[PDB]
């Protein structure tokens, strides 16, 4: 897939991503906070179509991501992120996608998710997270 | 003066500010780096005119600010920043303005100046700096 | 179990922990680096015996932990850490314990593991990690 790297910002206001209950996670675009103002980052699209879009608008700054988890599995022979669920201090969004494969979780006791990077082809290949106080 | 707060970014690519060899420092606008791309912040202008503009373009990222110093004094009864000099790992820019009053210096052994905030009326009233690794 | 919190230090020089190939992870004691000198933290022991001790001495500072993974499962009805493997930029230590249950992994692209906290009764109940630049 095509690699991407949003970099680091001051927080997260909204997350938009696609999913297919038959396959895996597709594209994604994040709206970060940048010193008090919304900042929409580059849209990272899937090479294909047929996904359902989910939009998660956080009640910034009172609401922030407290945990990220999901499953990684193989689709058409490619190892991709098949499901995602975001836990907030207010509520839980997900899971979305196929919860089959190897699970993973990143609970946070102290700190903030402040950026994303990764790779997307037909589906989300992999991703990493920026952390900060 | 009118207070301002640029917030924090990933670095500094260019600094633009005004000075009057008779009075003090005037307005200023900073071009920050934001995850590898130039980001021009709000222009913070003086309430008056008659200044000389100085533009400092840093050879980002090989060149970064290593020290900030200057003098604070009274002009027309107001306590303002009358002079500024920026020390880089490559060279020294300044001093600019009137080097009369109380000197101040912020040398940095490890770390980066990553943002500015302060207040400007007729002249630069005061400022603070964001620091980060 | 009894909760513990080593706090944060400047790095890690050595990790000592117990494991039982039949049950789960037992006690553990970490030797941190503190501004260039070894600092041995409190020994957090299991409520029982019958474990094998493993000592991982890192070639500090050239060698540092690059990834932590393992499995969490139930033993005698308690949910505990049953296995652990530490990936270093030099080599891999593990896995140790029973690799049965829910896997978890914490790969690090940039940053250092700089402290531990958690709970230990008969076995390691759970743990969290301190991260830092």
């Amino acid at each position: 897939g095509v690699t991407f790297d949003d970099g680091a910002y001051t927080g997260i206001r909204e997350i938009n991503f696609e999913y297919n209950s038959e396959t895996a996670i597709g594209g994604l675009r994040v709206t970060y906070d940048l010193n008090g103002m919304p900042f929409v980052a580059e849209d990272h699209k899937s090479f294909i179509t047929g996904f359902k879009p989910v939009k998660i608008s956080l009640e910034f700054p009172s609401e922030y991501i407290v945990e990220v988890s999901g499953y990684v599995g193989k689709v058409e022979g490619y190892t991709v992120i098949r499901s995602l669920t975001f836990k907030t201090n207010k509520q839980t969004y997900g899971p979305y996608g196929v919860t089959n494969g190897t699970p993973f979780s990143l609970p946070i006791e102290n700190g903030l998710i402040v950026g994303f990077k990764g790779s997307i082809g037909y589906w989300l290949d992999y991703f990493s997270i920026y952390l900060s106080l | 003066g009118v207070t301002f707060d640029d917030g924090a970014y990933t670095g500094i690519r260019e600094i633009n500010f005004e000075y009057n060899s008779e009075t003090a420092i005037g307005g200023l606008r900073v071009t920050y780096d934001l995850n590898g791309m130039p980001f021009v912040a709000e222009d913070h202008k003086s309430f008056i005119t008659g200044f000389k503009p100085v533009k400092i373009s840093l050879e980002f990222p090989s060149e970064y600010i290593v020290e900030v110093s200057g003098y604070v004094g009274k002009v027309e009864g107001y306590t303002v920043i009358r002079s500024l000099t920026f020390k880089t790992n490559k060279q020294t820019y300044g001093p600019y303005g009137v080097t009369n009053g109380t000197p101040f210096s912020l040398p940095i052994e490890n770390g980066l100046i990553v943002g500015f905030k302060g207040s400007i009326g007729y002249w630069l009233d005061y400022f603070s700096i964001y620091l980060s690794l | 179990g009894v909760t513990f919190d080593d706090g944060a230090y400047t790095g890690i020089r050595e990790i000592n922990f117990e494991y039982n190939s039949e049950t789960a992870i037992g006690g553990l004691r970490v030797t941190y680096d503190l501004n260039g000198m070894p600092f041995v933290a409190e020994d957090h022991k299991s409520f029982i015996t019958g474990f094998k001790p493993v000592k991982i001495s890192l070639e500090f500072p050239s060698e540092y932990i690059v990834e932590v993974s393992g499995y969490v499962g139930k033993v005698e009805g308690y949910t505990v850490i049953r296995s652990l493997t530490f990936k270093t930029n030099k080599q891999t230590y593990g896995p140790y314990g029973v690799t049965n249950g829910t896997p978890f992994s914490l790969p690090i692209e940039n940053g250092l593991i700089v402290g531990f906290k958690g709970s230990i009764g008969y076995w390691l109940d759970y743990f969290s990690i301190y991260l830092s630049l």
Partner: peptide, 16 residues
């Protein structure tokens, strides 16, 4: 050592 601010990055997840 340059003028770029460093960040703590955890991951990736997607090759497991």
């Amino acid at each position: 050592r340059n003028g770029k601010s460093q960040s703590i990055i955890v991951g990736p997840w997607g090759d497991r």
